[PDB]
User: What shape does this take?
Amino acid sequence: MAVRASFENNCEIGCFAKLTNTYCLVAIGGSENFYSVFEGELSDTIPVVHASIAGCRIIGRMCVGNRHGLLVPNNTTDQELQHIRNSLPDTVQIRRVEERLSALGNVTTCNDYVALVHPDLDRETEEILADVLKVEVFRQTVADQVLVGSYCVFSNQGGLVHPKTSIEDQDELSSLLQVPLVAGTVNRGSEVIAAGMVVNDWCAFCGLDTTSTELSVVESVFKLN
Amino acid sequence: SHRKFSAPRHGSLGFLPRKRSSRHRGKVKSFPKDDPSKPVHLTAFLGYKAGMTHIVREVDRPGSKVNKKEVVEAVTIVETPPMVVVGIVGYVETPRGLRTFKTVFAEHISDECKRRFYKNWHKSKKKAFTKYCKKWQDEDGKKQLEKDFSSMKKYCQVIRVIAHTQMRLLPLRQKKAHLMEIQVNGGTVAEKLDWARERLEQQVPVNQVFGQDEMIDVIGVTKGKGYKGVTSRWHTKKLPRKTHRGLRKVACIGAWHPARVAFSVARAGQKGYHHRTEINKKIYKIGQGYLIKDGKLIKNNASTDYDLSDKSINPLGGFVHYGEVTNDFVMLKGCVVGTKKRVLTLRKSLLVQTKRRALEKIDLKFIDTTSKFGHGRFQTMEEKKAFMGPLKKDRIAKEEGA
Amino acid sequence: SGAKFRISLGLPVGAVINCADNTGAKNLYIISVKGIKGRLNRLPAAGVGDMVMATVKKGKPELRKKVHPAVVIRQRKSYRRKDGVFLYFEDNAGVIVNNKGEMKGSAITGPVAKECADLWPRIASNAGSIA
RNA sequence: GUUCAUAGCGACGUCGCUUUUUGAUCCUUCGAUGUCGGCUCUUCCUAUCAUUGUGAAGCAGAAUUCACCAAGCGUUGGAUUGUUCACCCACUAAUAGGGAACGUGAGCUGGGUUUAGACCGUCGUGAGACAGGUUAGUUUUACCCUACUGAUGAUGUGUUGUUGCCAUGGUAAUCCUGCUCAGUACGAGAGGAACCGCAGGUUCAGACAUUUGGUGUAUGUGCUUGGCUGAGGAGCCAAUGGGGC
RNA sequence: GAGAUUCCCACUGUCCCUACCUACUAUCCAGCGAAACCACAGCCAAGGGAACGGGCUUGGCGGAAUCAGCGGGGAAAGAAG
Ligand SMILES: [Mg+2]
Ligand SMILES: [Mg+2]
Ligand SMILES: [Mg+2]
Ligand SMILES: [Mg+2]
Ligand SMILES: [Mg+2]
Ligand SMILES: [Mg+2]
Ligand SMILES: [Mg+2]
Ligand SMILES: [Mg+2]
Ligand SMILES: [Mg+2]
Ligand SMILES: [Mg+2]
Ligand SMILES: [Mg+2]
Ligand SMILES: [Mg+2]
Ligand SMILES: [Mg+2]
Ligand SMILES: [Mg+2]
Ligand SMILES: [Mg+2]
Ligand SMILES: [Mg+2]
Ligand SMILES: [Mg+2]
Ligand SMILES: [Mg+2]
Ligand SMILES: [Mg+2]
Ligand SMILES: [Mg+2]
Ligand SMILES: [Mg+2]
Ligand SMILES: [Mg+2]
Ligand SMILES: [Mg+2]
Ligand SMILES: [Mg+2]
Ligand SMILES: [Mg+2]
Ligand SMILES: [Mg+2]
Ligand SMILES: [Mg+2]
Assistant: This one.
């Protein structure tokens, strides 16, 4: 169910967490009020790891994962790689890709079965996705927007998308992922959906400024409570 | 009329006699306040500025951006061979201040220590303390010495020990040792006299005075810069290019009245070679020095718990303008006043260290030992020879070496 | 939390930097830096991650003769990053944001400094890469 | 001032202070005290803009206003103008007001005024005039005394050295942001704090060169132009030949 | 057009914000060797006074001989404004 949250008075909770059905990465600079909401509302089984990447807290935008695997970007230290490894369940395998577009959460989004990807991914990293996230990579992005990862959040039950998506791109998208995509917003008018929200299959965290009306659509599209 | 725009003053008036220091050593001027509840301990030490390098360590500062992260921090190496105690001074409190009550010197004063008493050691007859040391043997002199100790016990309030460094263990040209009064704190006057009297003629290593990851004060004389103008001495604004008689000057050195030049106006003169006291310098490491049990041990100087490389604190090709460091050393964090091989005074902190910057455990991961005589790129000799392989001079040597 | 450490600024008032977003602006002319108290004769200068007041000198005509808040995302001046890394970029670049910190545009061309990305999450989302 | 003289204001009157305005006077200076502004730099005042501690309100909170102790610290970057003033842009805790021969020209500058050249308008028959406009117009000397900045020394302790004490003088730190407290107290709501704690920054100060950058005639090592030593090799000259590191 | 003015590109140490290097000085020495100026001289606060004192009154105080600088004063010098 949509819990609102904030990391250090910032509503962009998509920047500071990564939820997958199996693990939950959460950023390091925070302080209980945020970590709790995760640990609390999370389904006990799914561990919650305090992580960073390259030292930074925006780990949700620097990291792409599903239940099978996490890809961390080239700037990831090995003190970090190790600590993500020594905290996740050893189903999930971690590969530190080496892609020019380090922002792996901005530039690719994946559920447990598909990934939209940004036109300019290296073929190398297309393979390291579909070999680690056991997924079907599909270089497709909406009209214009190439940062799929950030403008379109999707689970295995539904998905949101930038409010300014066409009914036709919606259409096609909802093919590839074979999930019902609704155009929407979060944090009271924000297009950058992914920046604002983190979704599982059983939980959703949105920012403290998400209007009730939005909170609803989230619940609905994600087929939650 | 008032100056049109406000601007803060250039330089501090708290260091006004901007003159060459009357001393080269750097005197303490304030010892830590003595409390008898503490155990008896020494409060200061003498070291020599060997050089600088940088280290890699992990930070344990919660709530910080660099929490659990690696940082690179510059450090200063201060070579600290053990001090030798040769005397005891007693002071008595008077309504005119502390005054020296009685001084007792040990027998067998070291030869390098005795050099301090002579302006021309080469022509001297080396007669200093020769008649004094005779009173440590006869009963008449020994009775007088015991009265001097008893008088110190019943009349003196603070006692100090005279300690000197050991020039023969340093790569310097100077053979004249540095004498220093180091205050003994932490006990009754009787206890600190008994403690000091046992240490006569003995060696006090630096690890008995200071400890790991504690913050001390460094006292010394800065690098001399000679006669300097106002732009370099007081960092005043340079005048425009169109100025006739010179632009590295202060344009107005005072109003018409008070009809004099004030002491607060920036003026040219000596820069550098000033006595300074910097507080809150953390001890990152106290090096262990060279040993010989079966072979020479150097690993205990630069190897960490994560490096495990048999290397000493000395850079590749040696410390520039200093020499080789073979004794105990203190790795202080940051910069320290003075040139290379400048004698420095290390003093216990006068403050109570309670902030989280203090009382923080320091655990080194890496110590840089690249050559500082250029853009060095190799930590050790063996790493360099492994990288480059055999060279032409190695071939012609091995040709002669069969 | 954690605040930004001090870095070398290298972009005084009057610097023209590139505009890295798709707002149609081509460059940003820095007229002042947010949070600068000042000093007599000292130019207010900005590094990466600093909010500045900027006007666009060339670009779309509806953005030109106005004052825009902007955030520096890349700089040509080297700066130390607390682990001995001295990093500099090929060009000085910034994006146009509002006072709340979110961008007027929607995409960023080129990398974004890690110092800027951590401090502005709305900028970090649109960043193609973080350097 | 919804009532209510005095929270905050104060008509009609009336008592003062100040010398950062302009007058009035003509005491000093006409065998000359260099005449505006800006720049630079120091110090002082308080009639306090901010910051510390407080009292009051028509002080719910937030914000604001009045007053007290208070000058420790700070009071900025620019467009136009010679400007002082002025006005606007922007940042800021605040962008307070003043003095020091309207501080400061053997400190600078010389944009202005205020010589001699010249143009215009008005005035004059004219020469010429104009707190009218415009353009071009030499900014001299310190080596003296003191002051100040540094540097040797000097008196006395027999000589000389080491280690010290402290009279006295100076003095230095400053302000802000974010997190948490906390969407909390308070409030119908809108909004919306604070103490402790943590992480950082600004201005200032004192250093320092491990790292990054600058310098570079180590005239170190390559490259290179013209010339010269018969050529090669090795070099040199071109007021540091030029250039890379 | 070595005429007066405004803007733009380029360019740069004009500036932020200063640093380093080179030559010649200055500096020290051997030799040589002026001039300007000069009532006497030369530490301040306040007072009064030709109303801004080096001298006078009252106080603060005052320690040989000097070197390199410096530009606050000598209402410094230069010229019967
Ligand atoms: Mg003022
Ligand atoms: Mg000139
Ligand atoms: Mg070096
Ligand atoms: Mg200025
Ligand atoms: Mg009434
Ligand atoms: Mg008269
Ligand atoms: Mg005159
Ligand atoms: Mg005069
Ligand atoms: Mg008052
Ligand atoms: Mg004047
Ligand atoms: Mg003058
Ligand atoms: Mg003049
Ligand atoms: Mg003129
Ligand atoms: Mg004329
Ligand atoms: Mg006529
Ligand atoms: Mg002319
Ligand atoms: Mg001379
Ligand atoms: Mg005192
Ligand atoms: Mg002061
Ligand atoms: Mg040639
Ligand atoms: Mg040849
Ligand atoms: Mg020739
Ligand atoms: Mg010639
Ligand atoms: Mg170079
Ligand atoms: Mg007087
Ligand atoms: Mg006359
Ligand atoms: Mg005449």
Q: What stands out?
A: The two ends of chain C are 21 Å apart (CA to CA).
